[PDB]
UniProtKB/Swiss-Prot annotation:
Subcellular location: Fimbrium
Protein name: Type 1 fimbrin D-mannose specific adhesin
Keyword tags: Fimbrium, Signal
Shown segment, full-protein numbering: 22 to 179 of 300
Cystine connections: none
GO biological process: cell adhesion; cell adhesion involved in single-species biofilm formation; cell-substrate adhesion; mechanosensory behavior
Superkingdom per UniProt: Bacteria
Function: Involved in regulation of length and mediation of adhesion of type 1 fimbriae (but not necessary for the production of fimbriae). Adhesin responsible for the binding to D-mannose. It is laterally positioned at intervals in the structure of the type 1 fimbriae. In order to integrate FimH in the fimbriae FimF and FimG are needed.
GO cellular component terms given for this protein: host cell membrane; pilus; pilus tip
Family from the record: Belongs to the fimbrial protein family.
GO molecular function terms listed in the Swiss-Prot or TrEMBL record: D-mannose binding
Major localization class: other
Gene of this entry: fimH
Length: 158
């Protein structure tokens, strides 16, 4: 089991870390949602699918920088919504193919009432998401750590 970003940066068998760089809606008013769809940015596959099935959770997700200070939100994982920053590990998604396929994670963030101006600075760290992978074959328990960075400013108008 291994993963990569949309630009080909890989995390190999056994886990590791990588940076993910995301475009963000540039203007989000209070009351609107900023969507950070990682399913178009992070892909994974199973390396021995005829014998092994891989099980993948979002173990935990943390907010940083302007997301931590200026937004509240949820994380949607494979169709179900949870608090973000996270308060539990999600259920499993099954990876049963050698085809790289999306990791089905998206953040839904909305500004706090006091937010205004540049609420997320371009280039800044906005989140760290831990993908946790186990299987039905051995005791493997690996983390793929995704450090999520903004490619552009997000403004909450005043
Ligand atoms: C087509 O494959 C073959 O012919 C073949 C032949 C011999 C051995 C293997 C093989 C490959 C990968 C394996 O472990 C990695 O991949 C697992 C499946 O994603 C993960 O659960 C596990 O954690 C680890 O990332 C293991 Cl244990 C065995 C494959």
């Amino acid at each position: 089991f291994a993963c990569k970003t949309a630009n080909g940066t890989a995390i190999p068998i056994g886990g590791g870390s990588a940076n993910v760089y995301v475009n963000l809606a540039p203007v989000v008013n209070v009351g609107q949602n900023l969507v950070v769809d990682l399913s178009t940015q992070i892909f994974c596959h199973n390396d021995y699918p005829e014998t092994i099935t891989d099980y993948v959770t979002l173990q935990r997700g943390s907010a940083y920088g302007g997301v931590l200070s200026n937004f509240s939100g949820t994380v949607k994982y494979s169709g179900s919504s949870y608090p973000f920053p996270t308060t539990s590990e999600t259920p499993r998604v099954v990876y049963n193919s050698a085809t790289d396929k999306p990791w089905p994670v998206a953040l839904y963030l909305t500004p706090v009432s006091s937010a205004g101006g540049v609420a997320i600075k371009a280039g800044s760290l906005i989140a760290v998401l831990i993908l946790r992978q186990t299987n039905n074959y051995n005791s493997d328990d690996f983390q793929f750590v995704w450090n999520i960075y903004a490619n552009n400013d997000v403004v909450v108008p005043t």
